[model samples]
Target: TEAEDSIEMYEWYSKHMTRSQAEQLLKQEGKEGGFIVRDSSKAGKYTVSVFAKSTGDPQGVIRHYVVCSTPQSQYYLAEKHLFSTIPELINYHQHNSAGLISRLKYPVSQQNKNAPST
Candidate 1:
């Protein structure tokens, strides 16, 4: 019953904005993200600043904010986790600490090839 009342209130408030106003707001907040203002002419409660869309993780590693008003069933999971390329991680370390990138080109190392065994 309380949820019903809330939904009814939300639906009613949604209509308060003119079509142009809502469209303008949407345009201001593009697909990347934006805010949603709850319309309440009633002087009691204020705006709900944080709206939940999903389980709060866009990158999965870090959570983005969303509102509780979002539907329970649907989850807007992020499509990709953008990451900076770590060229060093792509291959094994050559153990040479210099500007030049080296491969495990010589695994034992040419310099150490003739190293005496213990």
Candidate 2:
């Protein structure tokens, strides 16, 4: 039997980092709510909006990103995928974008709702 190369066969690529670590990375320059990193999938420019525990599960959270070349009609969506670490959001952006949006919708935090968008 041919041994499967799991790493190369993964739908996405990721390097693990704890939730606290991810928040720290996004906290730079006095900002919050998002982080950007290179797409290892070589799928072109991308970004994702991260919500800690947004999947309504403490084990992991929801990550949302965009796709398509045109800004006007670009698809906006997300995945229910739970990741052990935060960096998966960036690495999975391209791949997970192909997944379904979470069915576990919850209200955005009241503080976040009250706060002005930057």
Candidate 3:
């Protein structure tokens, strides 16, 4: 199943973050198309939070979308498009806006620093 695939390695996936945490991170990034994928409040579900900059506001508004899955376990941000894994769904959105306000451009992770392990 797609759930078996390891998403932890992906910078966008925030395994244990709350919605507010995700919102704060995205807001801090302040990019027009910055995004973060995190665990949803609902058990076993995921949420994608994106920052879309508008002309009227410099702060920009953050939009949250709960990723849905089909009976077959395929994931989708927009119901019209589905993928075998969460990474695939995110990859598609990175290049195309589809139904989203903007294409996912910047991937904001909880840990911005890439530490070197000894």
Candidate 4:
């Protein structure tokens, strides 16, 4: 399936921003149809402190929508990629207690880097 380009992404960081704030800001950036899945930590091995589900079905079906971020932060992507084995997510955090992008800057000139500006 062709993944939809993130037409509504903004400057909000999943590492710190709340669900409400992320949603509102996404809308301000012109995304009007997708719902924000900010609170996902209750199903199966899922735990708020372990697994952070900010996408997928509104009804909460695992692996149903775009992921966009992770507690580790660097692996943040447009989809949530998980495995069946389900290792200790906590261990990942423990190993790297402060996991975050050193700097997400220089994303290639924010405004239409690919376009041939007149």
Candidate 5:
């Protein structure tokens, strides 16, 4: 897979959503490890928001991680693992915490609430 693929095709990708919006959505879902991938305030960058319900923060906490890229254009949340595409990066994190606060379990997308209307 090449690194030039578009992330917008993935349901987990929430384009242009603000950090607060992502936080609210994750909080509303209220599940440990629930997550969403959103566009960062910075151009050409993406951010992932993960929800954690640990004893350390009884009220639950949302952690945001900015997805970085290598000079070769490979994407990665954890520096040790680089993927050719955003979806590949997401797939890796879904099953492994890697360096994130929690592994991405459930994906919450703004489109989830949309209804099919003709």
Candidate 6:
């Protein structure tokens, strides 16, 4: 929602918008939790990646998700979200793909920018 609000977002931004663009936008914003992507690719196309981790799994597992732009810059997870353990990532993504939710929203853990230090 707010661009993850930390440097961890650099990876996603850099991949989609280029390193300079990512740094520039991030720097320009200079605010808490928000970002902008001026223009990079076609307006109707986008690719986003996210990760998830859990202590519940004794294996200490983490997973990745490659969300694609379904329609004109809108995010959707078709099946690229991989799951190596319980709480299947694909199931979550599949549900989203089935029109269950407008978008797949995660709790935003380590995948997001780190919180500012006090």
Clash pairs (backbone) in predicted model 2: none
lDDT of 3 by residue, 1-118 (tens): 5454363445656776666765667666666656677765543567776664664556666777777777776878677998877666776666754567744556677654332324
Give the count of colliding residue pairs in each prediction: 5, 0, 0, 2, 0, 1
Collision pairs in model 6:
44-72
> All candidates' lDDT scores?
0.26, 0.33, 0.65, 0.29, 0.65, 0.34
Candidate 6 regions exceeding 4 Å error are 1-19, 38-44, 47-118
Score residue 72 of candidate 5 by CA lDDT: 85
Give the lowest summed-lDDT range of ten residues in model 1: 104-113
TM-score of candidate 2 to 2 decimals: 0.25
Question: In model 3, how many backbone clashes occur?
Answer: 0
Compose the digit string of candidate 5's lDDT tens values, residues 65-107: 7777777868787779888766677766557545677444676
Residue range with the least summed lDDT across 10 consecutive positions in model 3: 109-118
Q: What order do candidates take by TM-score, descending?
A: 5, 3, 2, 6, 4, 1
Which ten contiguous residues of candidate 2 have the minimum total lDDT?
103-112
| True-vs-predicted CA distance for residue 90, candidate 1, Å | 45
lDDT of 2 by residue, 19-116 (tens): 34433333321233333322323334233434443235443443544332323322223334433223343345546455676422222221122224
TM per candidate: 0.19, 0.25, 0.61, 0.23, 0.63, 0.24
Off by over 4 Å in 1: 1-3, 7-15, 32-118
lDDT assessment of candidate 4: 0.29
Per-residue lDDT tens digits for candidate 1, residues 58-88, read 4211111212221322111121221121122
Q: Which candidate is the best by TM-score?
A: 5
TM-score of 1: 0.19
Give the Cα error of residue 112 in candidate 4, in Å. 15
For candidate 6, write residues 9-102 as lDDT tens digits: 3323433444343333333323232232222354333333232223343322233323344433234445343333212433444464455553
